[model samples]
Target: MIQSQINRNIRLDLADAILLSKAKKDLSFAEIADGTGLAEAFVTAALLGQQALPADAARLVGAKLDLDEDSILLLQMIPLRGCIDDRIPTDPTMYQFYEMLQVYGTTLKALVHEKFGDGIISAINFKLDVKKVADPEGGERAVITLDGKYLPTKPF
Candidate 1:
């Protein structure tokens, strides 16, 4: 049996890594708030290093930037927490959902145009199904199902 070796010299911390990440591009508080699904004020405070971000905000921020539990917690601790515009982020999960929406939406549109004509599905009559598939490597893969009614727009 073989075991993976662990390196003990690595000392990277949450704030340090996040700050470094920010260095690549100065993402405004509003952008972080929008992307992370956190409030702008909270993102602002975290950016300033005044206090850590709260748990909810941390999780949102973490998931958006591929951060971990510690990173999210550290973000919420920074106080002096208000310095941005009015903003509202729907939800972290919704971000991923919206991304898929765009991809599928575009693909559907193209297919519909290529096959029939210009038309769109009625969102009111739509359905979705999601499941997990087991994988040999490690984590399971997500399977998403999209079902909707096709509706065509008519010019008046």
Candidate 2:
């Protein structure tokens, strides 16, 4: 009985508006996200249809973006989240991560399940952080921390 279902079209439109304003204002994600007490990645992800901001955070973000009233409320609305379209690894960046999972997934699952005893990881109760560091070459290395809780199942 989930009552938060909203028109997909509305979400799409809202997303475009937010992105457009973001560009027009020439604001960085971190800029809009400042003072929200949320991580930049999390804030930007939500703004891009990935995260759902809490009331104060959404209001702060909306104010920063000069969004309308309804837009601010929509910011607090839950994201359709996993609907991967136009971007995914289709962007080549995420695709590399997906590719890594494809190659190492079985090993990952084996070790994970063997130790944790069978359920799945919880993305709903998760935290992700990214750090950038210099590599040996004149390039950057991204270190990501994926902290998803282990949810185990019981015989029912």
Candidate 3:
């Protein structure tokens, strides 16, 4: 049966096993993502239990990870979103995002409302991409894009 609710324990256990298998196979996320016809970031997030994969992509990744049928099925189920156990992010990388929200969350909200009106962007209809570019000042920089369709609110 398809899981209507995600069990975090089960998902985390599978994620651990997937990580082990990926490491054992010495494969990169890009390599696993190949032939799946999905973005590498999306596949990587699915492997980490943050997202669900479609059957075909799940099958392709499962074959690479040597996942069991049950595990593959779990992958295809809707995930319990926002699976972070920490109330406040402890990981430096994750903390940076939280901090960014703290600093710019209001600014972003104001700007979005001003520019796009009272509606919100749809994460369900979203596309994300990451790129690397040289920082003229020094090192490389990440250019991340969060592209989502805008859905306007309507009166009932």
Best by lDDT: 3
Each candidate structure's count of clashing pairs: 13, 2, 0
Model 3, 106: alpha-carbon shift in Å? 0.3
- On lDDT, the stronger of 2 and 3 is 3
TM-score of model 3 (CA atoms): 0.91
How well does model 1 score by local distance difference test? 0.57
Q: Provide the overall lDDT of each model, using Cα atoms, as 2-decimal numbers.
A: 0.57, 0.81, 0.87
Q: Candidate 1's residue-wise lDDT over 1-156, tens digit each?
A: 221213211212344676667656665546667855654644654645544555666686666566766556555542333222233235676467666756797786788877766677664476555578997899898787666787777788
Of the pair 1 and 2, which is ahead by TM-score?
2
Q: What TM-score do all the candidates reach, one by one?
A: 0.36, 0.85, 0.91
Q: Which residues of candidate 2, in runs, are more than 4 Å off? A: 1-3, 86-88
Q: In model 1, which range of ten residues has the least summed lDDT?
A: 2-11
RMSD of 3: 1.6
Runs in model 1 lying further than 4 Å from the true structure = 1-90, 101-105, 154-156
lDDT string for model 2 (101-141, tens) is 88998987898899897988887798898899999978999
